């Protein structure tokens, strides 16, 4: 379909879940949006200022948290490494979970992620320095495994003790076609926490497609109002919710902002 629709969505309007295992490229995407002042940087600045708030200043922590669409990335991991034991990854596309192992164990071709973690280290009062972060991170990051929202049993049938946080960034919107299948993952998602367990959410706003590149792939177009209700019906409670009026560069994005929440498992 060119550039008309997005790719993987010609038959029911939203980029199908095989168009991340085939089209989806972690160095590419990689690239794109977490090179680095652009406004990828600048969003990606206020996302690390978010996460260092939730996770350092506020009381979000707890043994184990699970990360939910990590994607190839590892920047959403940095500040809550400082306040959580134990780490899990997990991602619906085998070739990000590949970029991540790479990164795991520092081999010489994974992404350089240097420049964002000195920012977390600045931002976090330098205690200590960029190699140190990382290592820390490495060590918490327990498990790599295969994710999918829409199934009931997200992680397939991986046995995990309960987890005190569920943090989402950017994958919902991308992973949803529709309200109801955004208000049933947020749902799945809640079958991995404990009862009181901590719910972090940082996604787009009015976006209906996202670009890798020339790549269009789709997003749920979400309004504060509609992500406020579906989170509250899928059984939780919001303890902040922020919006952020920073949007994407034009060429990548017809995003109207961004959101940022943390909702607590009834
Ligand atoms: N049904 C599904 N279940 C889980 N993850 C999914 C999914 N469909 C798409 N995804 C993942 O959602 C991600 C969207 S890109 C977000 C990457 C990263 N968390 C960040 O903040 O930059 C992709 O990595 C894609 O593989
Ligand atoms: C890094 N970007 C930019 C972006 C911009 C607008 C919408 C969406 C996105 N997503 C996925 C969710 C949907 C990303 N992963």
């Given at each position: 379909?060119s550039?008309?629709?997005?790719?993987?969505?010609?038959?029911?309007?939203?980029?199908?879940?095989?168009?991340?295992?085939?089209?989806?490229?972690?160095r590419?995407?990689?690239?794109?949006?977490?090179?680095?002042?652009?406004?990828?940087?600048?969003?990606?600045?206020?996302?690390?200022?978010?996460?260092?708030?939730?996770?350092?200043?506020?009381?979000?922590?707890?043994?184990?948290?699970?990360?939910?669409?990590?994607?190839?990335?590892?920047?959403?991991?940095?500040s809550?490494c400082?306040?959580?034991?134990?780490?899990?990854?997990?991602?619906?596309?085998?070739?990000?979970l590949?970029?991540?192992?790479?990164?795991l164990?520092?081999?010489?071709?994974?992404?350089?992620?240097?420049?964002?973690?000195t920012?977390?280290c600045?931002?976090?009062?330098?205690?200590?320095?960029?190699?140190?972060?990382?290592?820390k991170?490495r060590?918490?990051?327990?498990?790599?495994?295969?994710?999918?929202?829409?199934?009931?049993?997200?992680?397939?049938?991986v046995?995990?003790?309960?987890?005190?946080?569920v943090?989402?960034?950017?994958?919902?919107?991308?992973?949803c076609?529709?309200?109801?299948?955004?208000?049933?993952?947020?749902?799945?998602?809640?079958?991995?926490?404990?009862?009181?367990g901590?719910?972090?959410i940082?996604?787009?706003?009015?976006?209906?497609?996202?670009?890798?590149?020339?790549?269009?792939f789709?997003?749920?177009?979400?309004?504060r109002?509609?992500?406020?209700?579906?989170?509250?019906?899928?059984?939780?409670?919001?303890?902040?919710?922020?919006?952020?009026?920073?949007?994407?560069?034009?060429?990548?994005?017809?995003?109207?902002?961004?959101?940022?929440?943390?909702?607590?498992?009834?």
């Amino acid at each position: 379909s060119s550039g008309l629709v997005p790719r993987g969505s010609m038959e029911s309007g939203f980029t199908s879940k095989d168009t991340y295992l085939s089209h989806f490229n972690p160095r590419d995407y990689l690239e794109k949006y977490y090179k680095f002042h652009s406004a990828e940087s600048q969003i990606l600045k206020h996302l690390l200022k978010n996460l260092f708030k939730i996770f350092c200043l506020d009381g979000v922590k707890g043994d184990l948290l699970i990360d939910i669409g990590s994607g190839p990335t590892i920047y959403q991991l940095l500040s809550a490494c400082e306040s959580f034991k134990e780490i899990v990854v997990t991602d619906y596309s085998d070739q990000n979970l590949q970029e991540l192992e790479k990164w795991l164990k520092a081999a010489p071709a994974a992404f350089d992620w240097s420049p964002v973690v000195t920012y977390v280290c600045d931002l976090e009062g330098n205690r200590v320095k960029g190699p140190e972060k990382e290592e820390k991170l490495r060590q918490a990051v327990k498990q790599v495994l295969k994710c999918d929202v829409t199934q009931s049993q997200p992680l397939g049938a991986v046995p995990l003790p309960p987890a005190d946080c569920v943090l989402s960034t950017l994958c919902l919107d991308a992973a949803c076609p529709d309200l109801p299948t955004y208000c049933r993952a947020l749902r799945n998602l809640g079958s991995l926490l404990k009862p009181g367990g901590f719910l972090v959410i940082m996604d787009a706003l009015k976006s209906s497609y996202y670009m890798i590149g020339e790549q269009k792939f789709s997003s749920l177009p979400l309004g504060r109002e509609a992500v406020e209700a579906a989170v509250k019906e899928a059984g939780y409670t919001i303890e902040w919710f922020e919006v952020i009026s920073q949007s994407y560069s034009s060429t990548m994005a017809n995003n109207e902002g961004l959101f940022s929440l943390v909702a607590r498992k009834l």
